[PDB]
Amino acid sequence: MAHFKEYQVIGRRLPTESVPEPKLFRMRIFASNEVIAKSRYWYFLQKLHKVKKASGEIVSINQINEAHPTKVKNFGVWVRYDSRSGTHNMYKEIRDVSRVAAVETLYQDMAARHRARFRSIHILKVAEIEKTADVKRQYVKQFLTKDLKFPLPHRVQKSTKTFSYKRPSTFY
């Protein structure tokens, strides 16, 4: 997962003589490549419709890119995941510029704060908050205040040498 990529996977049941042209079901999948993408698609169609990969078909695999990959936007994401003793829904918020990179941050956040692996997480919905004050988290709301400005105290400079002759400072 160098980056996540968002794909649409459109699939359908296999046509029969009695019911040709099935319903063409489509999902949006976050995966590292098109193999995991198609795999995750069938995993979720199991949860909804009476179909598996043998009795079904993948009609379209299209990668989706950001309409504007370079504007910082507030993302609201709903995640259903598995804890060690139950299943839990939660809604989080990530400030970033793309859906795929917020999902990258979100999977790092679940695994860091809840020890939930990619195996246990169900991305319910990734929705950009359209206008300010519908952002409900203080760790994102603190980044929307006007004329925001902060320093970076205690700069640590990585030397390329083992021995230095100056007793380096941490100013910035």
């Binding site: 459109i10 490549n33 193999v35 995991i36 078909e57 009609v59």
Partner: protein
Amino acid sequence: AEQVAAERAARKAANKEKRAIILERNAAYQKEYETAERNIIQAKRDAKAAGSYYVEAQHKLVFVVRIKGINKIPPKPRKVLQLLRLTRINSGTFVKVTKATLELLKLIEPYVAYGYPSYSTIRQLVYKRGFGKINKQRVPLSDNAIIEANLGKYGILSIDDLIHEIITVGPHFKQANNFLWPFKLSNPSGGWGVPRKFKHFIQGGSFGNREEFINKLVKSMN
């Protein structure tokens, strides 16, 4: 003075004629590869322009590589690995996709990496690591007469005739594929890309169907 000159010159007269026939087969194979790829590309474009989706034909050929050693293998998958001629680690064969052969691939699934080989990967594989089964011996191809003397009864007269039979799964794929000795690949030159090989490709390991990334993986071994 013993008709040596006449049998000398007439052998190259035969050689030029067989070289000319092969040259005009490799020109016709090059055209149909280009014609087929462009027609598929326009198939996706013209279905997109008509509000439809172009469902690609399911792949008719895999290149299966045994990525697991020979110790501690259950009997039924072990017997299938012998029937697919994968007797050691990093060995590879082509398989023609049918529901009969698709069930072999499910049973050897934890032990092999497989997917769909491109023309480029088939060409480099046969040209570099291509060997014939000539009277139970393993003979490097290295010459069109080596292929002609063994597969000529199916029309396969040169190394591209053989490659054409592999990528386009023809009426004589089985005879042309059993003729090829199982490929003895190396370990991948950059590595496997994963810390642990013995998970599925989907889980982040190496085995299973990795449909189109087998081309990148096999070329590192080749």
